[PDB]
Subunit: 392 residues, 4 copies
């Protein structure tokens, strides 16, 4: 648990270094007023290099633990060597790899890469502004105003906006600008590429649904299906979207392993299958064999699940719809059936013609079991198969 | 129904606020000439917060209903606090979520996101222009000309074009520009990412088709198939594109649930299967069992559906092609067969050698049923199985 | 055939109008020197509106046929109305839809969209340069130099480079720039999005192959498979790439319809199956049933296709590899087998132990048939089944 | 082997030409001091055109072998013709196609395209800077300073930053800028598109995993599954990610050919199946038939692999988990079982009720074989089937 607060402290420490090391390379007159925080931060980096072994390519941590900043600043070394103070910022590599561990289970990896990159671009912009100030001719301006002009220039460059009111006056500023321009083009390319990768996946389920609906309606239009049916199909896909988000129950349950697929099947059907009179008191092992072989099917409003006088072979279990059971002439209603009720169960005991028509009222999802799948499983429970056989 | 006109009115009301609140923060001398519209608009937002509960994270609506604009303007509060007038614009969140409900069934979600973003960028540009004008030194210029210069500057920034003829002259303008530059880079990154996501999916079916055609022609070239066959295959894929858009009938019908797959099968085959002499007067339940087991197959021009003297096992149903039936020597024509006609039906009653050759004329899509699949289904209709058995 | 040359002429005619109409709106002193070409071009557009019905939302063609250009120019109408000359450019819509018909079978649709867009951007840039010149103060400069400055400005804007050496001096130029900046951001966003969509699909087969190789090597590393096997697997995937481009023969043949899948099977196996002694003189219908049930399998170098003394059940057909047949002790070579040769064929006639070991030399692709699949098909050819039965 | 060093030398030679040919077109006073390297480089290109035939659209190599550079420079030809020296740079086409051969097995093709493009953009920038210098008015500035200003201008243009402090002063510079602006927009579009294609695929496995987890949790929420189960499912997917990276063992083994799928099955199960008492001393052919039909299944912590008193049909093989075997009342522990141990093996010899309950301790992956799959394979090994039959 508390290691999260520690890695947030080490984030705050490396963020502190990423914002003071380049700034104190430009303004040494800031080094010592923040030396208490510097000692604390350096001791914190030293405290992290062993502690990173608790609840765990470690060279960036090893280098950032080394206090070359305190060395070059306290001894006032010349600038070309004083840049070795920047080894603290190697901790940003470790902290980015810490971020892709301590919040990658919670935050979308495309967006986490974007926030990590935007953070790096703001820290880079800060460092790049300090590089600009370092190359600028010495002048009597307030430190914040020269920094603001440098940060303005770098953001002008990195965003590729390029006003041109601040530009190189000297060769080394020009070389530096060439580098920071290429770096800004790369950074803004990474920003655009991250945002493209993120947006390309924001509604992937909805676009995948839309392209199945087009495939089905393009094909059906080629088959010259009537507008009434091609609407009972569009309305079905609208239902499947607004209920499930377009996913097939068959395809989703196949992406679960058998014990969890069984647990989900028990959670969905466990009460409704126990209350079938034909199964009353039969063993849990047999009920388990039923529920793993129940096939889902969706019926549209007004569609005939069962007619009358056809032989038939299936028993049905309402799960979210509702259903009307009707005389063979469809003139009179015998029942309304709702969630957790079943019909056609006589088809298990005898393959004989249907006594009543049955029609979905609203969109109606329900489960199906057939005398073939049923006989298959009863082949391995003779003790119940005999009961079914003698009931006829 | 009429709730659409209401949410279009609330769109017009929040669009009004998104274009007057920031403008009246710059020009208070516009506040009262539009106070009638302001009262009407505020009453409209108040009217929407309860009415949003009719045919339905509501904090943006709750905040935008609060008339902090009338408060800060009518009492002429200082600018740092007067920005609280902007709470009206929180209604844009509710109105964007209304748009992704009231036209997301009609318009492609990638393009709807793009139009929503472009709208936000134009409203943001307006607000950002007003922020620029607010930071500009007071001067005697017409209100429209200073606004035009500010809108020019913001579009120059947001599009990342950055001419530099308008640029910061002061620190607060510079900080503001840094912010608006980062915001413009982000906004233009969102625009490019939206357009990338949209274009990446404009011809997805055609590129998916092209990559199956390459897979098949790459593999066939590895197998050193003759150029004549690798053309009867390319011509088939061109046919499959220009008729169906490359979709397999098997794969499309599997993305329908059983009652609709049955209804589509009835719509395609229901007349042609009823007029088979062997099935004349057989029950609808049996015809349903036929049509669910008909397998589609496409024959290329000149290809032999049936030769002569092979034993054979299948009956065929023309659906869109045409066919020539021919003597065993292929010298003489017995028939031309077109949509809604069938041949080889003797293979159902007796597994005996074929009497006539049969060849597709144009590209020819047709359906296939075989003595194995047929016997399977007749195993569950003995009353017809006996008729078939005694006909031999 | 020749309609291609006609639509290329109509391309040249609409390209002519897209480059003269906006230019003559700026320089009327060019209208009449090109009036012969104008009459020819207008007659050509009039000639196309009926001829578009030969070998075929027609409003763009209908509008572009109307000679409002000859009307507004020859009568020297004021500029706000003279813009109606631009109706010729509506033909670009028809010509883009002609391009996505007359070369979309040949050119990748992502790249065809890119070339169509780049063409539109160059034509738009031309028109936008003319709009700039129209808004420019009247001055004594050569027509080409003012055009070059305007085309420089527009390309500076559209590419979002934005030097700022040419910028608005007046309100209408500023409004126009705001529009052309938003249009340039949109156009360059379309360019980047097109290029992103194109590059995202340049090596799709190779990246799909790479991600199966990673899935297999990640999983195998989790299973702690030895480095020697995880190399016989990487070498297999390198072979499968450099021969086939990573495609499974099973998956490719399933994307062909039965008559073409049969024709491909005949082309691959038709000679090698005819020369099996057990099948010599058996009917083509039976050979067809063999070749549709041959299963491909790849053997790596040095791998044992057959050992000795195991019972075995399969006959094998070399298709591209080579094989060594070896004594049961592996000490002595009986044969080298190459493309179009077969082994283990005794497994069809009798399920008895293998007499010789067999090992792939190089990577070796070959086909497999087994006594189970063989018996299945012989169940429907008793006339050959008896011959096989009595041969033992 | 050593051909790698040669193609790296030819890379260094074409890189030399890509950086001297355009530079010596601007500064002829550099031609002869580097003539030794020029002769060596030209001889190297001549040496490569035959040697490219060793361990192998050759027009770029043929043209680059021709020494038109030595011709135009040593004879001091006028600039419009002297540009023919650039034919050396056609070797970059050959060297890019060499790079996509000699490191495309090692480096991701999306990133290899990016590095190849960035290299081309830096070489193009160099050439474009030389074109700028060529069009610049003659002046007394050091060669490096004028080059630095030209390279600054080109990078300013290509990155689309466009400061505008260096801009055209003449018509030919303006035309050249228009071209280089369009080229820079195209190049930076290719950079952004490459980076988009690369980032879109950086965590493809993790986003594919996330979208199955959403599909399963969206569907389960629609089915109103309890939060306790929808957590035993999320915890399972977290386990499947952190162990395997979300891949199904079934789907991965199906992407191997039979001999390697067998070798992997032998590597995973070969010791644990040999040590089953029922299989002790049975032939390798039969063990091979077992291991190809073992089905993997993952059990979550605390889940019941076996209860007691159910009939049961399966034997299980622990592969990475651990398991507790428990009395029928679950009060007492009989065993802890770990990797390479098996249980329930009595289900092979007799389909009789289970004697002890069995529960996964941690997340537990293990393999399953059932009396049905077992009987199927024993149907083809009567010599062992008799032993199993008589053991009861
Ligand atoms: C996120 C990570 C971003 C890290 C960016 C680090 C940027 C480096 C900043 C250096 C600041 C100045 C260093 C030189 C010392 C002062 C000076 O006058 O140096 C004069 C030495 O020459 C310079 O001006 C240094 C120019 C290159 C800086 C990198
Ligand atoms: C992320 C955005 C990046 C921001 C970098 C800002 C760096 C500023 C460094 C100091 C510059 C400086 O001295 O600015 C001074 C302060 O002016 C400012 O407004 C400074 C604001 C700095 C923080 C801005 C934070 C913005 C965050 C996003 C919204 C000059 O003030 P003034 O013009 O004299 O004031 C007149 C009215 N009292
Ligand atoms: C789509 C949603 C876009 C929403 C953008 C809202 C932009 C805000 C506009 C503020 C306009 C001016 C507000 C300050 C009042 C006038 C003034 O002189 O303030 C002086 C106060 O200081 C300023 O200039 C405010 C600068 C920041 C504006 C945000
Ligand atoms: C979306 C595009 C954004 C447009 C923002 C326009 C903001 C304009 C605010 C007022 C500026 C203003 O006073 O412009 C005045 C009006 O000039 C204009 O053309 C204003 C046009 C404004 C509406 C433009 C709408 C364009 C829509 C896309 C096409 C100055 O006129 P002038 O130069 O004195 O006229 C001489 C000939 N009679
Ligand atoms: C920071 C801000 C920088 C400036 C931002 C300026 C905004 C630019 C927005 C540019 C939007 C253009 C996107 C065009 C994409 C496109 O072609 O989409 C297609 C056509 O879209 C349109 O026509 C919509 C155009 C909207 C313009 C706003 C998609 O159509 P579909 O109905 O999906 O059927 C396609 C059948 N082939
Ligand atoms: C690909 C298709 C691209 C089509 C782009 C068409 C661009 C239009 C060019 C108009 C050229 C000038 C038209 C006005 C006549 C001359 C003139 O002085 O108009 C003065 C009228 O006001 C203007 O300057 C027109 C400004 C808007 C042009 C659109
Ligand atoms: C696509 C790229 C777009 C190009 C638009 C060019 C529009 C040019 C309109 C006429 C401008 C003009 O008068 O330029 C004159 C001609 O200068 C040029 O080089 C014109 C070249 C025009 C065609 C360029 C084609 C480039 C194609 C891509 C490579 C001024 O010449 P100068 O400086 O007096 O010559 C001194 C040495 N003899
Ligand atoms: C990666 C491959 C990039 C290849 C880019 C090659 C760029 C060409 C550079 C040409 C350098 C100068 C050539 C002309 C000779 C010197 C001169 O004054 O020419 C005067 C001739 O006119 C020019 O200035 C040439 C302008 C076009 C250069 C291409
Ligand atoms: C990739 C980045 C592209 C870089 C192109 C550089 C082309 C430079 C050509 C020569 C320019 C030149 O003469 O620059 C002179 C040298 O200045 C420089 O710093 C040259 C550095 C050139 C190499 C830079 C390499 C950077 C690589 C990425 C980091 C002027 O020096 P200065 O201002 O007199 O020195 C005062 C203090 N001692």
């Amino acid at each position: 648990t508390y290691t999260l607060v520690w890695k947030v402290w080490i984030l705050a420490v490396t963020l502190y270094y990423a914002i003071r090391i380049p700034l104190t390379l430009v303004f040494p007159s800031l080094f010592s007023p923040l030396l208490p925080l510097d000692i604390l931060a350096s001791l914190a980096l030293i405290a992290d290099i062993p502690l990173d072994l608790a609840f765990e390519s470690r060279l960036p941590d090893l280098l950032a633990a080394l206090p070359l900043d305190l060395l070059v600043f306290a001894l006032h070394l010349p600038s070309p060597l004083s840049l070795l103070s920047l080894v603290r910022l190697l901790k940003l590599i470790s902290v980015q790899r810490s971020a892709t561990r301590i919040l990658s289970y919670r935050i979308n990896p495309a967006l986490l890469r974007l926030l990590s990159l935007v953070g790096f671009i703001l820290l880079a912009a800060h460092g790049i502004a300090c590089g600009w100030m370092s190359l600028q001719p010495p002048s009597e301006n307030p430190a914040g105003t020269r920094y603001l002009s440098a940060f303005y220039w770098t953001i002008t460059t990195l965003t590729t906006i390029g006003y041109g009111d601040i530009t190189p006056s000297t060769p080394t500023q020009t070389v530096y600008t060439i580098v920071i321009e290429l770096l800004g083009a790369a950074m803004y390319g990474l920003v655009i590429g991250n945002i493209a990768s993120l947006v390309s996946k924001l509604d992937a389920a909805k676009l995948l649904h839309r392209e199945r609906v087009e495939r089905v309606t393009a094909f059906l239009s080629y088959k010259r299906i009537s507008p009434e049916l091609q609407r009972r199909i569009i309305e079905y896909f609208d239902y499947l979207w607004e209920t499930r988000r377009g996913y097939e129950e068959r395809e989703v349950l196949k992406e679960l392993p058998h014990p969890l697929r069984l647990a989900v099947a028990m959670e969905i059907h466990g009460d409704v299958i126990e209350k079938v009179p034909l199964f009353k008191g039969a063993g849990e092992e047999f009920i388990r064999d039923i529920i793993l072989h129940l096939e889902p099917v969706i019926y549209g409003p007004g569609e005939y699940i069962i007619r009358a006088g056809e032989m038939g072979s299936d028993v049905y279990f309402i799960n979210r719809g509702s259903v009307e059971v009707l005389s063979a002439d469809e003139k009179t209603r015998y029942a309304i059936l709702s969630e957790g009720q079943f019909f056609g169960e006589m088809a298990l005991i005898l393959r004989a013609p249907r006594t009543a028509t049955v029609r979905a009222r609203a969109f109606c999802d329900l489960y199906r079991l057939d005398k073939e799948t049923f006989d298959r499983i009863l082949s391995r429970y003779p003790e119940i198969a005999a009961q079914i056989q003698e009931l006829a």
